[PDB]
Amino acid sequence: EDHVIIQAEFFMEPDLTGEFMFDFDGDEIFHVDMQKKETVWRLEEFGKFASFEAQGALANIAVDKANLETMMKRSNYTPNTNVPPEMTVFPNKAVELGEPNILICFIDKFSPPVLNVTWLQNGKPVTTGVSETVFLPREDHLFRKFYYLPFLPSNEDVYDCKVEHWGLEEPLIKHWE
Amino acid sequence: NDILSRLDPPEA
């Protein structure tokens, strides 16, 4: 098919986490932030050409929780299988010393949608300006997620993306320099 | 011009 629109929701227990997003050919259109009760467009410009009523999303998530609890009981409390991520670490653009850039940590093919992702610079945790997407859907019903780290490229800096997930026995750590 | 969502039938 030429194009695909996907509305993807989840609720998860005992974590009590839920997300609501729209997807076009594998990129996020928007999500609803559950804390802020707000439609967050993936790029702000999109909100000039479209609108979405956040309150509907929240209602769907309350109903998804209820539907989860019914399926938990009907399944005789069969738990979700932990499927561990795979990870890639790469720069957003062609890298040039001292011209700001963004390091991308892409995490793929995991369930459930819970990650502890840590950026390290020369062995030490860094957080300045970090951003992330929502849990992006896959056809196989596993998840994807992007983490962004603003950096100023140098000769001597080494970066590690460290991911923790219940599907891994030990952390999955990759680097770029 | 509104993106519409659909609701998963609620089990109550």
Partner: protein
């Protein structure tokens, strides 16, 4: 500690503008699809035994079958018309450089994914030697792709990186 996950997906598949529209309603417990509405079928289907009760409710709910059947129009064709006003035809031209790593063609910042990236040498395009990462999603509505050419460093000859992407009828070219 055990986890429990429920996923809902509403999919709209489009071909030839909106001549071919397929609506899918997926109910997914612990990553497995239990029950589906597929508008090509036009009835709900219990994919697993766990979905039969949930299929009975759906199928017994007052006007729900007709509402699912009308979703190709009320939801899919509706949402497409909104997205055709900015998303469906978004184009970002690629950014092209060459740099020594072996010779590297960096193609950055382009949408949509379909792209033709060729290595030329003194005017002729070679096929053997070329190694590609393939299409790399950036997650911000851009892709990148590094196309490398294992190359013998011999003075005299110009290597061109030829990039044809829908964003321009005309290619983006970088000599070395």
């Amino acid at each position: 500690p055990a986890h429990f996950l429920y996923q809902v997906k509403f999919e709209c598949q489009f071909s030839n503008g909106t001549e071919r529209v397929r609506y899918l309603h997926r109910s997914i417990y612990n990553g497995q699809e239990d029950v589906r509405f597929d508008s090509d079928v036009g009835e709900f289907r219990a994919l697993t035994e766990l979905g039969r009760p949930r299929a009975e409710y759906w199928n017994s709910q007052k006007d729900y079958l007709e509402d699912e059947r009308a979703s190709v129009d009320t939801y899919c064709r509706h949402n497409y018309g909104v997205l055709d006003g900015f998303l469906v035809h978004r184009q970002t031209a690629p950014t092209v450089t060459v740099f020594p790593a072996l010779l590297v063609c960096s193609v950055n910042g382009f949408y949509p994914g379909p792209i033709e990236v060729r290595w030329l040498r003194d005017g002729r395009e070679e096929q053997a030697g070329v190694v590609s990462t393939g299409l790399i999603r950036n997650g911000d509505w851009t892709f990148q792709m590094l196309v490398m050419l294992e190359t013998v460093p011999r003075s005299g000859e110009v290597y061109t990186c030829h990039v044809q992407h829908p964003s321009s009828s005309s290619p983006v070219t970088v000599e070395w």
